[PDB]
């Protein structure tokens, strides 16, 4: 169980790093799919089967429309990759790299300072998540439905051609 | 127990043999059979005449509005996935919450249908007259 | 009793077809010959035609595709619309001058192995159309394996030419792999159907009178 | 679309499926070339020959 | 006795296909009428320019042999005139316009075909539509391309 | 290695391997049976010359595909071009890896089940998308866009069609689902769920009438025109494995799976799966292909509210009898 979690975590880290430092949009989307598959594998190793199930179910459709928009605008041959290459320079990425590194080491210092007892890996079924979702957490569900409705209304209002 | 590790091993062997079989038939297809040489072999197929431009042009999909609605409706679907597995223990009150949820869902769907969204077909292709 | 063809588009040869043919002997090994027989059987018993049509001969070809003739029984019905997925180009129609580059392009876009059946008098020689805008035979610029006389040949004649193509494939030699062995294509110099059927054709004495049915 | 149109379309698809199933329960119409010989009419225009007189000499 | 089906004023793909179905039914009616009533006469005219003459008279009469000999070799001599025939083809209206110079060959043969006009009409009726509508329009026009290019 | 637990593990591994080989062989023989069944539907025979009854036609097809040259175009992105047939072959295989064919014969007894099938469908669309984009052809790009529009059409209600079955069974496991149909099959209470899942499952495999990405009449064979050799065969074999997977899943979800009165359970499962396979072929032979905008409008305006109302009515009926 440790092996699957650690291999999926390493794959997720590598695929995210390849995502943020790539010029090809379709290859970046493929590595993003790989990273989210690895994230769902991490979820499955921790016993949260529903979390990994929703990570593959709803993000396969999310990156699908990302592919649709990439085909819609970004694909132009080598010109788009060449234009994306000029925006990335050694100073340009070395600027915020040390900021991300110092933030990461501060958060790691924070993480290591807490007590630990180990994750037992006991599976949590979708039945318990459904009971808690429609039980103690009513208003989260209802106002999340209203939030998604609001986002849908915003998408309709902005995304019209004419 | 023993059944769980047996099932895990069976699933892992299923994955490994499936991927290895796909790779093996890909390798066998690539290695067997002589190659062909032609002047226009490495040209995209466009019914026998050279292309105008290339196939890497940007193509305006008309259903992008439906796509960014599809993501939202997929998330509503995941909420109903979570509800539907625990209907009996949720009780009638949980049925009331899900009824309100689904009523808001159809209200948004009727709103999308009526305002002209989910309708991207051209005027010549609307089958009028 | 074999002919060897090697192709080279990039070599110094301007006129189509870009290939060289000589007359050689049969190269055929206690297992390589049997494996070559097995792949020849698999290729001859599964031929996928190209959905390429020019004229009326293609209409008779797709008449052969339908239920009253059932060329699917020979495994030759799949009818791919892509040249890459097709194994047989049936030039079924007139080889027009404006479409000869199109025919050459579609022949270039097919992949090894490839076979050519010219259907009808137009595809064979230009037929009745000895005119300014018709190529006098598609074999002017592509190599043709099987010829079908007719205008149009009836669908059973198309299946007869398909069986002749199967008999030609079943005794030819081709490179098994593209990394080991000779890459030239060896095709048999078979006896013609005219001299084969001359014994049974000359001995015909009486036929039914045209007033009957 | 109208609900009546949807019901009519569903019944139409069901009816088409039923008729193709009854086609599966029907008789085959194939003439089995080359196992059975192709029937050709007496005045069918195929291969050209040169014929002889009843005396046995060539008629051309 | 046969009917001519007409539409309602809109030339859809469906309307053209159903009109051709009704034309098929009317052709079946014509075939039934002609099967039930076929005359008992000659299959060739008695004109001297009937090409070729009847075969048995050719095989046993010298006048008929001469007419056959000069009609299949040099060709029938049709006197110098212009002729035109317009018929209802399977895909529309087919017309032949023949100019004879008084010789045994046509001086001018003009063939009018309907598929030429339909393919010229194609951009004005499918502009602004999708490609699927174009596929259905191509399937519902009843054209062949020998008809168009001749 | 002499222990009951290790030989039980070996037996379970062997059963999973047997299931995998049988379903792959059944996909290839299902291609052959599609040819024969289309012949049967269209008053003809199909291939009946290669061996007895044409039984060796599939072997000749495999030999031809293996010895047809496999090429990668210079204008294509090679990695994605090789990757797409692998996904098309393997995604619905992994979807089939949860189908219970018999009591004691299942590869994975997952607690997610139909969730895993939804994951594999959402991963299977990317094969057609990658094949359409990577080949760098115009017809392929149009086919990929049509496939994306089709996924927009079907994936909204693909899971909500089966949420009624999940609600009736009270769990996500296929074993619980086939055990919940001990008294009556699920086609009778979940009939709107049945027809909506039939529509969505035919749309999953891109089978007719939902063959928008590869419509030969429209896009001249569509997205996989550059594919040939064993990649083209991978696409077709993966499609046929998808047909088998969707048929078996529908049998387990709406027709009890292996439950039957007199025959052995595998016999009933195979009979119902072959029934739905020949129904796939009957659907392909029978009805024409609609326009994909009409398909999207039908999937959004009709099928999705139908699944929502079906889930609401199913919940009301379940809580009424509880
Ligand atoms: C490179 C290829 C992929 C490598 C990473 C994924 C596979 C790693 C090896 C897994 C081997 C099996 C294993 O370790 O299973 C442990 C556990 C079993 O489940 P559980 O019930 O939690 O365990 C207690 C058992 N009584 O398993 C789990 O809890 C979940 C196991 C991981 C999740 C499934 C596989 C995810 C694959 C992601 C692929 C990403 C793209 C490549
Ligand atoms: C390469 C892959 C090698 C094998 C990886 C491990 C497979 C087994 C596994 O993931 O088991 C964990 C889980 C099953 O556990 P379950 O039986 O539900 O729980 C025990 C009962 N309390 O099963 C699961 O979580 C299954 C869901 C994840 C499987 C991912 C498979 C790859 C999918 C992407 C392919 C591209
Ligand atoms: C194991 C899995 C496989 C199982 C096999 C058996 C089941 C297979 C199911 C196949 C389903 C195919 C569904 C096809 C839906 C097509 C809908 C569509 O796009 O229709 C468009 C057409 C015209 O569009 P319209 O909206 O009128 O025009 C607007 C333009 N201004 O509008 C119409 O045509 C209107 C009518 C639409 C009818 C939709 C389909 C009805 C349900 C499917 C057919 C029946 C399936 C079998 C059911 C059980 C039978 C015992
Ligand atoms: C097994 C159950 C099968 C039920 C359907 C049987 C259909 C029988 C039939 O032949 O229907 C064809 C008919 C077509 O109607 P039309 O083209 O107007 O022709 C008039 C003369 N038939 O069709 C009709 O007239 C339609 C009438 C039948 C409608 C049946 C509706 C069943 C309930 C809804 C199921 C689908 C829901 C989709 C959402
Ligand atoms: C290595 C495995 C190779 C399998 C090859 C299968 C070829 C396709 C057979 C079924 C078929 C399909 C899908 C098909 O698309 C088709 O065209 C309409 C047919 O009829 C001509 C068919 O018979
Ligand atoms: C054309 C405009 C481009 C704007 C680029 C902005 C890039 C900002 C990079 C910031 C890097 C900070 C690194 C750490 C600095 C020291 C710690 C923070 C300040 C006390
Ligand atoms: C057309 C049928 C397709 C079925 C696909 C799935 C088959 C998987 C392989 C099953 C093998 C084992 C069968 C059950 C064995 C135990 C019972 C034996 C007596 C019936
Ligand atoms: S040979 Fe005759 S039937 Fe064939 S294409 Fe030429 S004119 Fe048409």
Whether the CB-CB separation of C5 and C185 falls below 8 Å is answered with yes
Kindly report the number of other CB atoms within 10 A of residue A132's CB atom.
Answer: 14
Which CA distances in Å does A134 have to A93, B77, B112, B124? 45, 15, 27, 47
Resolution in A: 2.9
**Ligand 5: which atom is nearest the Cα of residue F34?**
10
Whether residue C178 lies within 8 A of chain B, CB to CB, comes out as yes
DSSP assignments along chain D, one per residue: --HHHHHHHHHHHHHHHHHHHHHHTS------TTTSPPP--TT---S----B-TTSSB--
Angle, helices A25-45/A2-20, rounded to nearest 10 degrees: 160
F194 interaction partners in chain D (CB closer than 8 Å):
none
Work out whether strand C115-119 and strand C146-148 pair parallel, antiparallel, or are unpaired.
Answer: parallel
Whether the CB-CB separation of F301 and B118 falls below 8 Å is answered with yes
- Contact criterion met (CB < 8 Å) for A26 and F111: no
Question: For ligand 4, is residue D17 a contact (CB within 6 Å)?
Answer: no
**Gap from D4 CA to chain C (nearest CA, Å):** 37
Kindly report the number of other CB atoms within 10 A of residue F58's CB atom.
Answer: 22
Whether the CB-CB separation of A69 and B57 falls below 8 Å is answered with no
- Contact criterion met (CB < 8 Å) for F112 and A50: yes
Angle at B108 between CA B106 and CA B112, to 5 degrees: 110
Going by alpha carbons, the residue nearest to atom 4 of ligand 5 is: F233
**Ligand 8: which atom is nearest the Cα of residue C121?**
1
The continuous run of DSSP H or E covering C188 comes out as strand C185-188
**Nearest-angstrom CA–CA distance, B122 and B127:** 10
Whether the CB-CB separation of F250 and F198 falls below 8 Å is answered with yes
Which residue in F304, A55, D46, F76 sits closest to B73, CA to CA?
A: F304
Name the token pair of E131: 């490609």
Every domain of chain B and the residues it spans = 2-115
Dihedral of CA atoms F285, F286, F292, F293 in degrees, nearest 10, equals: 170
**Gap from C7 CA to chain B (nearest CA, Å):** 7
Angle at A60 between CA B24 and CA F190, to 5 degrees: 100
Question: For ligand 5, is residue C79 a contact (CB within 6 Å)?
Answer: yes
Nearest chain E residue (CA) to F142: E131
Q: Do chains F and E touch (3 or more CB pairs under 8 A)?
A: yes
A39 interaction partners in chain F (CB closer than 8 Å):
none
Of C51, C74, C85, which has the smallest distance from its Cβ to F228's Cβ?
C85
Provide the CATH number for the domain formed by A1-159 in this structure.
1.20.120.1200
Kindly report the number of other CB atoms within 10 A of residue B17's CB atom.
Answer: 17
**Nearest-angstrom CA–CA distance, A65 and B27:** 33
Q: Do chains E and B touch (3 or more CB pairs under 8 A)?
A: yes
**Nearest-angstrom CA–CA distance, F183 and C158:** 58
Q: Which residues contact D14 (CB under 8 A, 6 or more apart)?
A: none
**Nearest-angstrom CA–CA distance, E42 and B16:** 82
DSSP assignments along C27-72, one per residue: ---TTHHHHHHHHHHHHHT---BB----SHHHHHHHHHHSTTT-GG
Dihedral of CA atoms C139, C145, C151, C153 in degrees, nearest 10, equals: -170
Inter-chain CB pairs, D–F, below 8 Å: 36
CB half-sphere exposure, F300, CA atoms < 13 A:
29
E146 interaction partners in chain C (CB closer than 8 Å):
55-56
Judged by its nearest atom, the ligand closest to the C-alpha of residue F302 is: 4
Cis peptide before C17 (omega within 30 of 0): yes
Of B13, B55, B70, which has the smallest distance from its Cβ to F13's Cβ?
B13
Nearest chain C residue (CA) to B43: C109
Dihedral of CA atoms E56, E57, E61, E62 in degrees, nearest 10, equals: -110
DSSP annotation of A72: I
Residue carrying the six token digits 């050799």: F229
Dihedral of CA atoms C189, C190, C194, C200 in degrees, nearest 10, equals: 160
- Helix residue spans in chain F (DSSP H): 4-41, 57-67, 78-96, 114-134, 138-154, 163-169, 174-179, 192-204, 216-219, 230-254, 265-286, 292-298, 304-321
Name the token pair of F128: 């057609």
**Nearest-angstrom CA–CA distance, D52 and D59:** 5
In our burial notation (b when 16+ CB lie closer than 10 A, e otherwise), range F6-15 reads eeebeebbeb
**Gap from F291 CA to chain A (nearest CA, Å):** 20
DSSP annotation of C187: E
Angle, helices F57-67/F4-41, rounded to nearest 10 degrees: 100
Q: How long is chain E?
A: 150
The continuous run of DSSP H or E covering C21 comes out as strand C19-24
Of E10, E126, E129, which has the smallest distance from its Cβ to B129's Cβ?
E10
**Nearest-angstrom CA–CA distance, A150 and B108:** 10
Q: Do chains B and A touch (3 or more CB pairs under 8 A)?
A: yes
Residue carrying the six token digits 């005794």: C171
Query: Can you name the CATH fold of B2-115?
Result: Methane Monooxygenase Hydroxylase; Chain G, domain 1 (1.20.58)
Distance C87 CA to ligand 8 centre (A): 23
The SS3 assignment for B37 reads coil
Whether residue D3 lies within 8 A of chain F, CB to CB, comes out as no
Q: Which residues contact F243 (CB under 8 A, 6 or more apart)?
A: F27, F30, F205, F207, F277, F280
C56 interaction partners in chain E (CB closer than 8 Å):
146
The SS3 assignment for E29 reads helix
Whether the CB-CB separation of F65 and F230 falls below 8 Å is answered with yes
CB half-sphere exposure, F11, CA atoms < 13 A:
10
**Ligand 6: which atom is nearest the Cα of residue A102?**
14
Answer CATH for C2-203 from 3.40.50.12280, 3.30.1490.20, 3.40.50.300, 3.40.50.1820: 3.40.50.12280
Which residue in F162, F210, F212 sits closest to F187, CA to CA?
A: F162
Angle, helices D3-24/F4-41, rounded to nearest 10 degrees: 90
Name the token pair of C3: 């002919």
Cβ-in-10-Å burial (0-12, 13-18, 19+) of B85 comes to buried
Nearest chain F residue (CA) to D16: F286
In our burial notation (b when 16+ CB lie closer than 10 A, e otherwise), range C176-188 reads bebeeeebbbbbb
Which residue in C148, C134, C142 sits closest to C92, CA to CA?
A: C148
Phi (first) and psi of residue E125, to 5 degrees? -110, -10
The SS3 assignment for E107 reads strand
Q: Which residues contact F291 (CB under 8 A, 6 or more apart)?
A: E130, E132
**Nearest-angstrom CA–CA distance, E142 and E139:** 7
Q: Which of F24, F28, F103, F105 to mutate to test the pocket of ligand 7 (most atoms within 8 A of CB)?
A: F105
C-alpha of C36 from chain center: 21
**Gap from A32 CA to chain B (nearest CA, Å):** 17
E133 interaction partners in chain B (CB closer than 8 Å):
124-125
Whether the CB-CB separation of F214 and F134 falls below 8 Å is answered with no
Dihedral of CA atoms B10, B13, B17, B19 in degrees, nearest 10, equals: 110
**Nearest-angstrom CA–CA distance, F172 and B87:** 12
Longest dimension (CA), chain C: 64
**Gap from E114 CA to chain C (nearest CA, Å):** 18
Q: How long is chain B?
A: 129
C-alpha of B56 from chain center: 22
**Nearest-angstrom CA–CA distance, A18 and E79:** 86
Ligand 3 cavity residues, CB under 6 Å: B 126-127; D 1, 5-6, 9-10, 13-14; F 195, 198-199, 201-202, 209, 246-247, 250, 276, 279-280, 283, 290, 294-295, 297-298
Query: Does D18 appear as a known binding residue?
Result: no
Longest dimension (CA), chain E: 69
Every domain of chain A and the residues it spans = 1-159
**Nearest-angstrom CA–CA distance, E17 and F100:** 49
- Contact criterion met (CB < 8 Å) for B115 and A156: yes
**Gap from F207 CA to chain E (nearest CA, Å):** 18
Phi (first) and psi of residue E99, to 5 degrees? -105, 120
**Nearest-angstrom CA–CA distance, E111 and E105:** 16
B34 interaction partners in chain C (CB closer than 8 Å):
112-113, 174-178, 183
- Contact criterion met (CB < 8 Å) for E130 and F293: yes
Phi (first) and psi of residue B43, to 5 degrees? -130, 135
Nearest chain C residue (CA) to E145: C55
Whether the CB-CB separation of C185 and C114 falls below 8 Å is answered with no
**Ligand 5: which atom is nearest the Cα of residue F32?**
9
Judged by its nearest atom, the ligand closest to the C-alpha of residue F195 is: 3
Touching subunits for chain E (3+ Cβ pairs under 8 A): B, C, F
**Gap from F58 CA to chain D (nearest CA, Å):** 22
Whether residue B7 lies within 8 A of chain F, CB to CB, comes out as yes
Cis peptide before D34 (omega within 30 of 0): yes
Question: For ligand 2, is residue F116 a contact (CB within 6 Å)?
Answer: yes
Q: What are the residues of chain B with a beta carbon less than 8 Å away from any beta carbon of chain C?
A: 31-41, 43, 45, 48-49
Q: Which residues contact F312 (CB under 8 A, 6 or more apart)?
A: B98, B99, B102
Residue carrying the six token digits 């869902």: B105
**Ligand 3: which atom is nearest the Cα of residue F290?**
19
Which residue in A53, A65, A82 sits closest to A29, CA to CA?
A: A65
Whether the CB-CB separation of F28 and F55 falls below 8 Å is answered with no
Which residue in C51, C45, C114 sits closest to F61, CA to CA?
A: C45
Question: For ligand 2, is residue B22 a contact (CB within 6 Å)?
Answer: no
Question: For ligand 8, is residue C151 a contact (CB within 6 Å)?
Answer: yes
């Amino acid at each position: 169980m440790e092996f699957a979690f650690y291999i999926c975590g390493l794959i997720a880290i590598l695929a995210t790093l390849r995502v943020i430092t790539h010029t090809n949009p379709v290859h970046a989307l493929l590595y993003l799919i790989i990273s989210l598959l690895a994230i769902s594998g991490v979820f499955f190793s921790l016993g949260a089967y529903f979390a990994g199930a929703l990570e593959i179910i709803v993000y396969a459709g999310a990156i699908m429309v990302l592919f649709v928009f990439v085909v819609m605008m970004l694909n132009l041959g080598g010109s788009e990759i060449e234009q994306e290459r000029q925006w990335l320079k050694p100073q340009v990425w070395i600027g915020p790299a040390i900021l991300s590194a110092i933030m990461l080491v501060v958060i790691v210092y924070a993480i290591l300072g807490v007590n630990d007892q180990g994750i037992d890996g006991t599976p949590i079924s979708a039945k318990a998540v459904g009971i808690t979702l429609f039980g103690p957490y009513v208003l989260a569900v209802e106002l999340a439905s209203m939030l998604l409705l609001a986002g849908l209304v915003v998408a309709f209002h902005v995304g019209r051609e004419e | 127990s023993t059944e769980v590790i047996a099932h895990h091993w069976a699933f892992a062997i299923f994955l490994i043999v499936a991927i290895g079989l796909c790779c093996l038939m890909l390798v066998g297809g690539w290695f067997l059979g002589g190659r062909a040489r032609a002047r226009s072999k490495n040209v995209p197929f466009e019914s026998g005449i050279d292309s105008v431009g290339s196939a890497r042009l940007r193509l305006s999909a008309k259903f992008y509005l439906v796509a960014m609605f599809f993501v939202i409706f997929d998330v509503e679907a995941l909420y109903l996935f979570a509800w539907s597995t625990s209907i009996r223990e949720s009780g009638w009150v949980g049925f009331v919450e899900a009824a309100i949820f689904i009523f808001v869902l159809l209200a948004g769907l009727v709103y999308l249908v009526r305002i002209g969204a989910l309708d991207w077909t051209p005027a010549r292709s609307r089958r009028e007259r | 009793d074999y002919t060897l063809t090697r192709i080279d588009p990039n070599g110094e040869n301007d006129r189509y077809p870009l290939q060289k043919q000589e007359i050689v002997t049969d190269p055929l090994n206690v297992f390589m010959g049997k494996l070559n027989d097995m792949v020849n059987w698999g290729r001859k018993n599964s031929i996928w035609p190209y959905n390429f049509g020019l004229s009326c001969c293609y209409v008779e070809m797709v008449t052969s595709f339908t239920a009253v003739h059932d060329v699917a029984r020979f495994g030759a019905e799949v009818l791919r619309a892509s040249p890459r997925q097709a194994d047989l180009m049936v030039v079924a129609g007139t080889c027009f001058t404006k479409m000869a580059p199109v025919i050459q392009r579609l022949y270039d876009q097919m992949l090894e192995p490839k076979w050519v059946i010219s259907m009808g008098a137009c595809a064979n020689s230009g037929g009745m159309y000895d005119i300014y805008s018709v190529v006098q035979g598609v074999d002017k610029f592509i190599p043709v394996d099987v010829y079908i006389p007719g205008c149009p040949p009836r669908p059973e004649a198309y299946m007869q030419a398909l069986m002749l193509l199967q008999e030609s494939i079943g005794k030819e030699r081709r490179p098994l792999s593209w990394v080991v062995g000779d890459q030239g294509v060896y095709r048999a110099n078979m006896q013609s159907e005219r001299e084969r059927k001359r014994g049974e054709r000359i001995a015909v004495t009486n036929l039914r009178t045209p007033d009957e049915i | 679309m109208t609900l009546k149109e949807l019901l009519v379309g569903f019944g139409t698809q069901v009816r088409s499926i039923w008729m193709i199933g009854l086609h599966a329960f029907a008789k085959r119409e194939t003439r089995m070339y080359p196992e059975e010989p192709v029937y050709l009419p007496p005045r069918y225009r195929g291969r050209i020959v040169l014929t002889r007189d009843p005396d046995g000499e060539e008629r051309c | 006795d046969f009917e001519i089906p007409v539409g309602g004023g809109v030339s859809d793909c469906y309307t053209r296909v159903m009109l051709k179905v009704e034309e098929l039914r009317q052709s079946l009616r014509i075939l039934e009428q002609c099967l039930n009533n076929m005359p008992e006469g000659p299959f060739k005219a008695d004109h001297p320019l009937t090409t070729p003459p009847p075969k048995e008279r050719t095989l046993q009469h010298i006048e008929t042999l001469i007419t056959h000999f000069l009609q299949v070799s040099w060709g029938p001599v049709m006197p110098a005139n212009e002729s035109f025939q317009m018929i209802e083809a399977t895909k529309g209206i087919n017309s032949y316009y023949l100019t004879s110079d008084g010789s045994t060959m046509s001086y001018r043969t003009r063939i009018r075909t309907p598929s030429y006009a339909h393919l010229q009409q194609i951009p004005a009726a499918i502009r602004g539509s999708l490609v699927s509508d174009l596929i259905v329009y191509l399937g519902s026009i009843d054209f062949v391309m020998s008809d168009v290019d001749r | 290695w002499i222990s009951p637990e290790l030989i039980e593990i070996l037996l379970t591994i062997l059963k999973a391997v047997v299931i995998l080989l049988v379903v792959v062989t059944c996909g290839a023989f299902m291609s052959f049976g599609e040819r024969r069944l289309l012949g049967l539907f269209q008053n003809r025979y199909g291939p009946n010359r290669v061996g007895w009854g044409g039984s060796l036609q599939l072997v000749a097809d495999m030999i031809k595909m293996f010895f047809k040259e496999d090429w990668i175009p210079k204008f294509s992105d090679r990695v994605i071009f090789t990757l797409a047939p692998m996904i098309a072959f393997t995604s619905l295989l992994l979807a089939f890896a949860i189908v219970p064919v018999s009591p004691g014969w299942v590869v994975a007894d997952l607690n997610i089940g139909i969730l895993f099938f939804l994951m594999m469908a959402g991963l299977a669309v990317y094969a057609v998308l990658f094949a359409g984009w990577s080949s760098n052809n115009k017809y392929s790009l149009l086919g990929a866009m049509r496939a994306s529009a089709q996924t927009l059409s079907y994936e909204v209600f693909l899971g909500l069609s089966l949420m009624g079955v999940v609600a009736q069974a009270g769990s996500f496991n296929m074993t619980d689902i086939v055990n919940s149909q001990a008294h009556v099959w699920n086609v009778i209470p979940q009939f709107f769920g049945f027809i909506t899942f039939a529509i969505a499952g035919v749309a999953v495999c891109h089978r007719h009438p939902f063959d928008q990405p590869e419509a030969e009449q429209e896009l001249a064979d569509g997205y996989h025109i550059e594919y040939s050799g064993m990649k083209f065969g991978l696409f077709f074999v993966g499609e046929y494995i998808g047909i088998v997977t969707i048929s078996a899943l529908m049998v387990t979800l709406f027709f009890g799976g292996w439950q039957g009165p007199l025959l052995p359970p595998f016999i009933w499962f195979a009979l119902k799966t072959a029934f739905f396979m020949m129904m796939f072929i009957l659907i392909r032979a029978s009805l024409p292909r609609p326009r994909y905008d009409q398909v999207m409008s039908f999937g959004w305006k009709i099928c999705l509210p139908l699944t929502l109302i079906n889930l609401l009515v199913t919940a009301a009926v379940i809580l009424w009898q509880a």
